[PDB]
Amino acid sequence: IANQFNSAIGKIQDSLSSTASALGKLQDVVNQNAQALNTLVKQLSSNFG
Amino acid sequence: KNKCVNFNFNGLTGTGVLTESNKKFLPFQQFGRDIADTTDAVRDPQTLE
Numbered sequence A: 001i002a003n004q005f006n007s008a009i010g011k012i013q014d015s016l017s018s019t020a021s022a023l024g025k026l027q028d029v030v031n032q033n034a035q036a037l038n039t040l041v042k043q044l045s046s047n048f049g
Numbered sequence B: 001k002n003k004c005v006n007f008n009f010n011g012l013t014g015t016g017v018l019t020e021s022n023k024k025f026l027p028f029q030q031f032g033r034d035i036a037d038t039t040d041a042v043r044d045p046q047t048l049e
């Protein structure tokens, strides 16, 4: 049971070391808040008539 | 330079701090713009830096 937990924590390191998209839930929340400020900055360039 | 001022370059009125750029404007351009369409660099009309 200790060997299986120690082996399974070793796979957490290997997974996080390997794959790009896993933390997508947090990066998507950064990307929305950054895209919303970038859209608000681009809207200063508009003439509005 | 390096002080807050009410500038005017060729009628481009504004307020800001002027510093020596390392942006290399091709001869046909007097101004550089930002994402917000505001001027963020300018070529001085008497000494062409």
Ligand SMILES: *[C@@H]1O[C@H](CO)[C@@H](O[C@@H]2O[C@H](CO)[C@@H](O)[C@H](O)[C@H]2NC(C)=O)[C@H](O)[C@H]1NC(C)=O
Pocket (backbone or CB within 6 Å): B045, B046, B047
């Ligand atoms: C603004 O004035 C300066 C001179 O006061 C003009 O620049 C001169 O240009 C000649 C030819 O390259 C150089 O021999 C001089 O050394 C430059 N002047 C200075 C002060 O060093 C400039 O042409 C004027 N502005 C415009 C738009 O013509």
